[PDB]
Write an enzyme that holds these catalytic residues in place. Structure first.
Site, mmCIF file in Angstrom:
data_model
loop_
_atom_site.group_PDB
_atom_site.id
_atom_site.type_symbol
_atom_site.label_atom_id
_atom_site.label_comp_id
_atom_site.label_asym_id
_atom_site.label_seq_id
_atom_site.Cartn_x
_atom_site.Cartn_y
_atom_site.Cartn_z
ATOM 1 N N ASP A 33 0.808 -1.240 0.000
ATOM 2 C CA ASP A 33 0.000 0.000 0.000
ATOM 3 C C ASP A 33 0.838 1.287 0.000
ATOM 4 O O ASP A 33 1.291 1.724 1.022
ATOM 5 C CB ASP A 33 -1.009 -0.017 1.165
ATOM 6 C CG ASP A 33 -1.891 1.217 1.151
ATOM 7 O OD1 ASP A 33 -2.010 1.811 0.053
ATOM 8 O OD2 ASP A 33 -2.509 1.579 2.224
ATOM 9 N N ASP A 220 -1.319 5.535 -5.499
ATOM 10 C CA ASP A 220 -1.917 4.750 -4.345
ATOM 11 C C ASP A 220 -2.217 3.307 -4.794
ATOM 12 O O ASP A 220 -3.290 3.020 -5.329
ATOM 13 C CB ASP A 220 -3.177 5.461 -3.745
ATOM 14 C CG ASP A 220 -3.755 4.747 -2.572
ATOM 15 O OD1 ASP A 220 -3.215 3.693 -2.207
ATOM 16 O OD2 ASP A 220 -4.770 5.295 -2.003
HETATM 17 C C1 LIG Z 1 -9.518 1.918 -0.649
HETATM 18 C C2 LIG Z 1 -8.642 2.215 0.589
HETATM 19 O O1 LIG Z 1 -9.082 2.771 1.631
HETATM 20 N N1 LIG Z 1 -7.374 1.863 0.454
HETATM 21 C C3 LIG Z 1 -6.346 1.996 1.528
HETATM 22 C C4 LIG Z 1 -5.700 0.632 1.745
HETATM 23 C C5 LIG Z 1 -6.728 -0.472 2.085
HETATM 24 C C6 LIG Z 1 -6.498 -1.727 1.493
HETATM 25 C C7 LIG Z 1 -7.431 -2.766 1.710
HETATM 26 C C8 LIG Z 1 -8.528 -2.588 2.540
HETATM 27 C C9 LIG Z 1 -8.770 -1.327 3.113
HETATM 28 C C10 LIG Z 1 -7.841 -0.253 2.911
HETATM 29 C C11 LIG Z 1 -5.321 3.079 1.088
HETATM 30 O O2 LIG Z 1 -4.318 3.309 2.119
HETATM 31 C C12 LIG Z 1 -6.070 4.414 0.872
HETATM 32 N N2 LIG Z 1 -5.098 5.445 0.551
HETATM 33 C C13 LIG Z 1 -5.441 6.808 0.934
HETATM 34 C C14 LIG Z 1 -6.766 7.213 0.170
HETATM 35 C C15 LIG Z 1 -7.254 8.598 0.662
HETATM 36 C C16 LIG Z 1 -6.243 9.748 0.729
HETATM 37 C C17 LIG Z 1 -8.417 9.055 -0.246
HETATM 38 C C18 LIG Z 1 -7.907 8.335 2.044
HETATM 39 C C19 LIG Z 1 -6.888 7.660 2.944
HETATM 40 N N3 LIG Z 1 -6.835 7.567 4.306
HETATM 41 N N4 LIG Z 1 -5.671 6.821 4.572
HETATM 42 C C20 LIG Z 1 -5.433 6.618 5.991
HETATM 43 C C21 LIG Z 1 -4.476 7.625 6.626
HETATM 44 C C22 LIG Z 1 -5.156 9.031 6.688
HETATM 45 C C23 LIG Z 1 -4.172 7.115 8.029
HETATM 46 C C24 LIG Z 1 -3.143 7.729 5.850
HETATM 47 C C25 LIG Z 1 -4.966 6.422 3.450
HETATM 48 C C26 LIG Z 1 -5.747 6.947 2.394
#
Ligand SMILES: CC(=O)N[C@@H](Cc1ccccc1)[C@H](O)CN[C@H]1CC(C)(C)Cc2nn(CC(C)(C)C)cc21
Length: 377
Positions: A33, A220
């Site tokens: 990720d 991402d």
């Molecule tokens: C679709 C999703 O949420 N993907 C995240 C990874 C994941 C993989 C499998 C199951 C659930 C989650 C991925 O880290 C998302 N990346 C960014 C996508 C954003 C910027 C739109 C929102 C966000 N929040 N985070 C969490 C944090 C603020 C703690 C960095 C990561 C992100």
């Protein structure tokens, strides 16, 4: 290299690499990720986990006595921080001590049949939870070993089951063709980049370029879709509709909530346009473009029940949180996260997307004498 072909996945469910945690080593599959910066593994039973981290069985486990909570776009988890020895059997031949969040509760995070039991957040400490003093894995790996500060991802999701490579410390030239074009990492938190122009079928969406980066754009691997800020997503959908107007689809399809299906082998790829994303180059007012085919943004949904057809979900969706260049757009490119030179490189990958008429491409340079910074803030 022994690193080639070390990723697997199911389509829409992320790509994972085999790791071990603890001593003696416990084998886990871990989601790769670049969109987050916490290393977290299931560490208690869950209906969707085949296996989980057993801290009691690890003599090298150290508890940090501190809880942590991570909410992503829809899923979330909470757990307990500690450190332990970690290895990547099909990566660099090293063992490092790293922070590890032991997930003990979760909601909408684990996915039924995905085959992974944890997540490797490969972005920077600025966005680690609980705060930026929790050193991310990759930082630990670089500090503790002589691994150069660089990794690359070749996500194929080619022939449910998908593959690719994560190459740590290096660029594997057998994984791409043509040249590598670099875009600057704008700020080290997410892998933040700048989109300067968007075209559909070569037609410019004609927006002020800051709209494309409202309010950041990131690369991402943990997100499936190309996600676009509302104003850009609406403009893009209108364009793609117009290009493909020989067929009409329900609104639910464009919203990503309904499949579109064609009798097997007859998907009309040629009615859908390509999409070109121009990314800021390393020199002022220069850019290069990555061009994506509908084979990338119409994501196949495997389901034996619908298998007299091929059925697809539209993998461009609306974002209230900035542009997210997800796996859709990474697939068929070799993407080099060159942390050491604060840039990300794109090249067409050995598993590129490809049709007898059109090919995904990475190409440049393009110049714009118009002097507007496309960074949002
Ligand atoms: C679709 C999703 O949420 N993907 C995240 C990874 C994941 C993989 C499998 C199951 C659930 C989650 C991925 O880290 C998302 N990346 C960014 C996508 C954003 C910027 C739109 C929102 C966000 N929040 N985070 C969490 C944090 C603020 C703690 C960095 C990561 C992100």
């Amino acid at each position: 290299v022994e690193m080639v072909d070390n990723l697997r996945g199911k389509s829409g469910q992320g790509y994972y690499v085999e790791m071990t945690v603890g001593s003696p080593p416990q084998t886990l599959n871990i989601l790769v990720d670049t969109g987050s910066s916490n290393f977290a593994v299931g560490a208690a039973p869950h209906p969707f986990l085949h296996r989980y981290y057993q801290r009691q069985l690890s003599s090298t486990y150290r508890d940090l006595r501190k809880g942590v909570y991570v909410p992503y776009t829809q899923g979330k988890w909470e757990g307990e921080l500690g450190t332990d020895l970690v290895s990547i059997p099909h990566g660099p031949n090293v063992t490092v001590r790293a922070n590890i969040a032991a997930i003990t509760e979760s909601d909408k995070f684990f996915i039924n049949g995905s085959n992974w039991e944890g997540i490797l957040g490969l972005a920077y400490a600025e966005i680690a939870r609980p705060d930026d003093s929790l050193e991310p894995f990759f930082d630990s790996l670089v500090k503790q070993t002589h691994v150069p500060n660089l990794f690359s991802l070749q996500l194929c999701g080619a022939g449910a089951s998908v593959g690719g490579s994560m190459i740590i410390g290096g660029i594997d030239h057998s994984l791409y063709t043509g040249s590598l074009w670099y875009t600057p990492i704008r700020r080290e938190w997410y892998y933040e980049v700048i989109i300067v122009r968007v075209e559909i079928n070569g037609q410019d969406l004609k927006m002020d370029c800051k709209e494309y980066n409202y309010d950041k754009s990131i690369v991402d691997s943990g997100t499936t879709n190309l996600r676009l800020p509302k104003k850009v997503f609406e403009a893009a959908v209108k364009s793609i509709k117009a290009a493909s107007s020989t067929e009409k689809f329900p609104d639910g399809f464009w919203l990503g909530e309904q499949l579109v299906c064609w009798q097997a082998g007859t998907t009309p790829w040629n009615i859908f346009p390509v999409i070109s994303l121009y990314l800021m180059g390393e020199v002022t007012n220069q850019s290069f473009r990555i061009t994506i085919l509908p084979q990338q943004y119409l994501r196949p949904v495997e389901d034996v029940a619908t298998s007299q057809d091929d059925c697809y979900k539209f993998a461009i969706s609306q974002s209230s949180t900035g542009t997210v260049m997800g796996a859709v757009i990474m697939e068929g490119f070799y993407v080099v996260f060159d942390r050491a030179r604060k840039r990300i490189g794109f090249a067409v990958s050995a598993c590129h997307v490809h049709d007898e008429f059109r090919t995904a491409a990475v190409e440049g340079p393009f110049v714009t004498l118009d002097m507007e910074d496309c960074g949002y803030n």
